[PDB]
Design a binder for these strands. Structure first.
Ligand SMILES: [Mg+2]
Ligand SMILES: [Mg+2]
Ligand SMILES: [Mg+2]
Ligand SMILES: [Mg+2]
Ligand SMILES: [Mg+2]
Ligand SMILES: [Mg+2]
Ligand SMILES: [Mg+2]
Ligand SMILES: [Mg+2]
Ligand SMILES: [Mg+2]
Ligand SMILES: [Mg+2]
Ligand SMILES: [Mg+2]
Ligand SMILES: [Mg+2]
Ligand SMILES: [Mg+2]
Ligand SMILES: [Mg+2]
Ligand SMILES: [Mg+2]
Ligand SMILES: [Mg+2]
Ligand SMILES: [Mg+2]
Ligand SMILES: [Mg+2]
Ligand SMILES: [Mg+2]
Ligand SMILES: [Mg+2]
Ligand SMILES: [Mg+2]
Ligand SMILES: [Mg+2]
Ligand SMILES: [Mg+2]
Ligand SMILES: [Mg+2]
Ligand SMILES: [Mg+2]
Ligand SMILES: [Mg+2]
Ligand SMILES: [Mg+2]
Ligand SMILES: [Mg+2]
Ligand SMILES: [Mg+2]
Ligand SMILES: [Mg+2]
Ligand SMILES: [Mg+2]
Ligand SMILES: [Mg+2]
Ligand SMILES: [Mg+2]
Ligand SMILES: [Mg+2]
Ligand SMILES: [Mg+2]
Ligand SMILES: [Mg+2]
Ligand SMILES: [Mg+2]
Ligand SMILES: [Mg+2]
Ligand SMILES: [Mg+2]
Ligand SMILES: [Mg+2]
Ligand SMILES: [Mg+2]
Ligand SMILES: [Mg+2]
Ligand SMILES: [Mg+2]
Ligand SMILES: [Mg+2]
Ligand SMILES: [Mg+2]
Ligand SMILES: [Mg+2]
Ligand SMILES: [Mg+2]
Ligand SMILES: [Mg+2]
Ligand SMILES: [Mg+2]
Ligand SMILES: [Mg+2]
Ligand SMILES: [Mg+2]
Ligand SMILES: [Mg+2]
Ligand SMILES: [Mg+2]
Ligand SMILES: [Mg+2]
Ligand SMILES: [Mg+2]
Ligand SMILES: [Mg+2]
Ligand SMILES: [Mg+2]
Ligand SMILES: [Mg+2]
Ligand SMILES: [Mg+2]
Ligand SMILES: [Mg+2]
Ligand SMILES: [Mg+2]
Ligand SMILES: [Mg+2]
Ligand SMILES: [Mg+2]
Ligand SMILES: [Mg+2]
Ligand SMILES: [Mg+2]
Ligand SMILES: [Mg+2]
Ligand SMILES: [Mg+2]
Ligand SMILES: [Mg+2]
Ligand SMILES: [Mg+2]
Ligand SMILES: [Mg+2]
Lengths: 50, 64, 84, 96
RNA sequence: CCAUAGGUUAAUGAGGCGAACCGGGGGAACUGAAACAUCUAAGUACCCCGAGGAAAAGAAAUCAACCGAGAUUCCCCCAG
RNA sequence: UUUUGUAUAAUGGGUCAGCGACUUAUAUUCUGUAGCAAGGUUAACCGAAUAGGGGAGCCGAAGGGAAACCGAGUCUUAACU
RNA sequence: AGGACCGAACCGACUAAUGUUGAAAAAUUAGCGGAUGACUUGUGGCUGGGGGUGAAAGGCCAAUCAAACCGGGAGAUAGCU
RNA sequence: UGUAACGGGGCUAAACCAUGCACCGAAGCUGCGGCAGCGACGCUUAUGCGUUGUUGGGUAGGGGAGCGUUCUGUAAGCCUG
RNA sequence: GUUUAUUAAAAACACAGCACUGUGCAAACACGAAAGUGGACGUAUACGGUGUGACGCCUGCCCGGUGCCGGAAGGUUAAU
RNA sequence: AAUUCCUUGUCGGGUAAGUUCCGACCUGCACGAAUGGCGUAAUGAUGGCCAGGCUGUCUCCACCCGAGACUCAGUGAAAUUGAACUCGCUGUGAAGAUGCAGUGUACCCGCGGCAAGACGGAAAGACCCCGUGAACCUUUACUAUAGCUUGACACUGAACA
RNA sequence: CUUUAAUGUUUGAUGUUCUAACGUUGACCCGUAAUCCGGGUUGCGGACAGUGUCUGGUGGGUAGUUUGACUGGGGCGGUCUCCUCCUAAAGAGUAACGGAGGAGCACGAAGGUUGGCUAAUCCUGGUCGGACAUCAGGAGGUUAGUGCAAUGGCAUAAGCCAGCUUGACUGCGAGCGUGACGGCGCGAGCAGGUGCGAAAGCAGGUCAUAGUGAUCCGGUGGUUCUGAAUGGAAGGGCCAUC
């Protein structure tokens, strides 16, 4: 269970977020993905958090 | 004496129009990253009690 | 001793049966969305009006009558539906 | 609720909701209840005297149930759109 | 040293008993939870003190909700 | 009586007579029956009263939603064929 | 002189037999140990139950003891017969 | 323990193998008489009758219908020196 | 000598002797919510606890663990 | 060896013959120094072994004397018991039969005596297992707690360094 | 700020005395005919000791309890959830302390899409180089490969490579499969907003089947809900999460 839960928070500032897992011993850089924001109903950049 | 309702059951069932009981689905509390979004979306709405379980629920909820 | 103590086995494990197989056979009248066969791999391939799910579950994409057939150069088993 | 020793149904399901204290004091009045009121005007006080609703009731609604056949005034009571159409057709006047 | 403690006498009162009810001071465990420790049984059983024909409580530093009610006690609802 | 199974060498009874074990109160649900019926019924209490009074209340005629709220619709959702 | 020796009363209880619905809910018979001592005995008193007392065996505490007896909680509980 | 490996007597078929016709043989079937449950149909208006088919082993258990005992009203009636 | 009154009298218990240890007296310790009492009208040649068990020859090595005694610089640490 | 499993270890003594006994050896499964080691005169209703005397302990029982047993008169229990017109054998069968099958034998009823059976009588097995049973005991099981101990505050004050 | 000297306050500590609380099972007097007690005087000790509340440690001294099940009796051992195969008798399902193996993950690429590509092994020839490295040809045809067990599947590849990219999307969801139930699984299609492709189209994770934990209790973010006189707020509810 090396992979740990991480939170991806939208850059639109609406407070919505997704959850996933990441291996942090390798690939230590932040994860960025254009994902759908259900509140503003648009695709915005989500940034690593938690 | 009056029959005493099971308060834990009265905090978990609600009576419907025809006399059935509705309940919140299980498996939607604390381990939610690994669960698929389709599965959680189906667990979000309320569900009717099953015919095999109406007997226990009516016994626990006399007044309702 | 009066009795000889035995050993222990190491084979006690097994997994639950997955209820695979053909659900509706030839001639069945099915609604759209009805599951025809539940499979591991594509033992039966999807024909006309039949869809294949992620676990290779063959399901009806239309109302009609199920038909099994053998087609193609490889003599593979296809499931199709005559719309009725 | 005992199931032999496994987790019972009323304990393996989650709790939900809360009991609102406003619902206790809110009541409902049918159109047929209007005709069994004396005075020609429908109020909290007048309905409590006629015994349609309890005395703890602070909020009331008129819903489309039964049939109203007489002109009557409903003042200061929320009324659904179906009841409003029915009351107007029966000739009553509605206001807040 | 005055005093006070102590001593004598006299006057009045109490003592002890009693089935339940009542107020107060102490206060279980079996049992239930299908085990058990929080919890329950239960402030029950029991022990003790006191009083009366009743006792206790009682005349809002009380409720209510922007309307108002008006000490206490008991019964039926509220409401399992 | 207990059992898969008892003539069982498995349990119980020496015999007779008397006694000896599914009750009662309250609450809830279903059935039957009776009254009334979109209504039904009172509780305490009053009453000399099995009468009469007493509708405080409770059940039913509306549901959906966690809830505000809306309402023969409602919830879900930005919106639902 | 002696927790000295032999041995009655007196205190005990090693062996055998009898007895075992006994003469007796622990005795009888024949032997047996101590017998001036850490002995034995009469009368009275004191220690009380999770307590007493115990040259200690979980022994004894009214024919009852790994927690006396009596009354109460109590119709404890008993998925057992 | 005693013949004790046809149930026995006994059997040279009264054994075995074929063929065939008889007969015995159950609470099965049929005949005669009776009772009951269910269904169908007809009639009567029913609250039943008739015809007809069929059913009727039974533990746990479910359903239905009764008998009898003590006491209350009918009953200051009726039975009874 | 004592012991399982009523299936065990023994090699068991006790014992004189030995050692360790506590205790300076309002002693340690014990029975007591407490007052008190025993220890003891005793005072370290006394008293308590523990182990061993006349006497003779002796009682060897280990303080890492648990306990006990002593230390107190530093780390951690309660109510406040 | 009160300790040694292998083990009746091996050697010696005692006996015609000794798994016990005595003395040695040491291969101490698994002795050991105050939960004391080794020895020890005396003592012991203490454990084991040997010898003399003595004998009905025995070879192997015989006889005798008394109390019962046995008979008569009087009084007069008890455990137990579904009912009983209560045989053997072989087989069967809840798998060991007076009762079932086949078969054999057997006139009816007492009294004395024996104890093979009636899975005889007695005690709802004490061994074994089960109960989400009990009790008591132990501990570095859990949770507490009496006690012991630590500090703050209160009873509790003055002055100085 | 490493620092000393010094002013001043507070805090904290220590030691030293004092008497006046408190202790006295020291003496003497009185109540008193009294080894109790109380009062008085005096000596000693002395704000210590002791006690009350709070608090840390210690505490089988005492107390209440727990100490699982399966099991060819129990104990010992082994096992307990999930996946694959056989037993399993050609639908599903099917037991044993039956026979064999695995899982408690991994991957922002190892996912989506477009385009492209096709192995194992052997023979022949070829520098180090050989049985076996890279190369050319041939045979052969999946005897390979699949992130990890086994079964089924895979060439239109589900296997291999590259470009672009985030659909590992949000709200739903006809219908269906599978469970006593809790629940689990499949799913076209609809809406919104996306990615790849010229386009038809494909994409709601991975070739599929293990990689998992109900409820309660809390934590975090948001919220058009509720808010015990009213306006807030705490707390609760809903949604997303631990
Ligand atoms: Mg949540
Ligand atoms: Mg294996
Ligand atoms: Mg469980
Ligand atoms: Mg009313
Ligand atoms: Mg308790
Ligand atoms: Mg208890
Ligand atoms: Mg319990
Ligand atoms: Mg229980
Ligand atoms: Mg009086
Ligand atoms: Mg019986
Ligand atoms: Mg049995
Ligand atoms: Mg049996
Ligand atoms: Mg039979
Ligand atoms: Mg018999
Ligand atoms: Mg019998
Ligand atoms: Mg009997
Ligand atoms: Mg009776
Ligand atoms: Mg009823
Ligand atoms: Mg009725
Ligand atoms: Mg002597
Ligand atoms: Mg005498
Ligand atoms: Mg004896
Ligand atoms: Mg004698
Ligand atoms: Mg002597
Ligand atoms: Mg003597
Ligand atoms: Mg006794
Ligand atoms: Mg006791
Ligand atoms: Mg006890
Ligand atoms: Mg005792
Ligand atoms: Mg009780
Ligand atoms: Mg009882
Ligand atoms: Mg013979
Ligand atoms: Mg016949
Ligand atoms: Mg029949
Ligand atoms: Mg019948
Ligand atoms: Mg004895
Ligand atoms: Mg004695
Ligand atoms: Mg002796
Ligand atoms: Mg000793
Ligand atoms: Mg030593
Ligand atoms: Mg040490
Ligand atoms: Mg030996
Ligand atoms: Mg020899
Ligand atoms: Mg020897
Ligand atoms: Mg040894
Ligand atoms: Mg020791
Ligand atoms: Mg030692
Ligand atoms: Mg010794
Ligand atoms: Mg002696
Ligand atoms: Mg006689
Ligand atoms: Mg016989
Ligand atoms: Mg026989
Ligand atoms: Mg016979
Ligand atoms: Mg014979
Ligand atoms: Mg005889
Ligand atoms: Mg006999
Ligand atoms: Mg005899
Ligand atoms: Mg016998
Ligand atoms: Mg017997
Ligand atoms: Mg159990
Ligand atoms: Mg003293
Ligand atoms: Mg302790
Ligand atoms: Mg304990
Ligand atoms: Mg078990
Ligand atoms: Mg066996
Ligand atoms: Mg085990
Ligand atoms: Mg199959
Ligand atoms: Mg099959
Ligand atoms: Mg892949
Ligand atoms: Mg407010």
């Amino acid at each position: 269970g090396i992979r740990e839960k991480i939170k991806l928070v939208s850059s639109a500032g609406t407070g919505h977020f997704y959850t996933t897992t990441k291996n942090k011993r390798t690939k230590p850089e932040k994860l960025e993905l254009k994902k759908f924001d259900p509140v503003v109903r648009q695709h915005v950049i989500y940034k690593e958090a938690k | 004496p009056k029959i005493k309702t099971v308060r834990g059951a009265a905090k978990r069932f609600k009576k419907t129009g025809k006399g059935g009981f509705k309940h919140k689905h299980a498996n939607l509390r604390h381990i939610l990253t690994k669960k698929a979004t389709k599965r959680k979306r189906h667990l979000r709405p309320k569900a009717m009690v099953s015919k095999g379980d109406l007997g226990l629920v009516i016994a626990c909820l006399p007044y309702a | 001793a009066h009795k000889k103590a035995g050993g222990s086995t190491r084979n006690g494990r097994d997994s639950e049966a997955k209820r695979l197989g053909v659900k509706r056979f030839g001639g069945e009248s099915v609604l759209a969305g009805s599951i025809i066969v539940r499979q591991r791999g594509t033992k039966f391939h999807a024909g006309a009006n039949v869809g294949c799910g992620r676990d290779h579950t063959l399901f009806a994409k239309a109302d009609g009558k199920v038909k099994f057939e053998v087609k193609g150069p490889k003599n593979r088993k296809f499931i199709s539906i005559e719309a009725e | 609720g005992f199931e032999g020793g496994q987790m019972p149904l009323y304990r393996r399901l989650p709790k939900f909701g809360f009991t609102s204290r406003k619902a206790a004091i809110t009541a409902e009045i049918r159109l047929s209840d209007l005709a069994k009121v004396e005075g020609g005007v429908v109020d909290l006080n007048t309905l409590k005297a006629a015994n349609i609703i309890g005395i703890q009731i602070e909020f009331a609604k008129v819903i489309l149930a039964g049939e109203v056949t007489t002109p009557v005034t409903v003042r200061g009571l929320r009324v659904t759109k179906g009841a409003r159409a029915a009351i107007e057709a029966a000739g009553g006047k509605i206001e807040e």
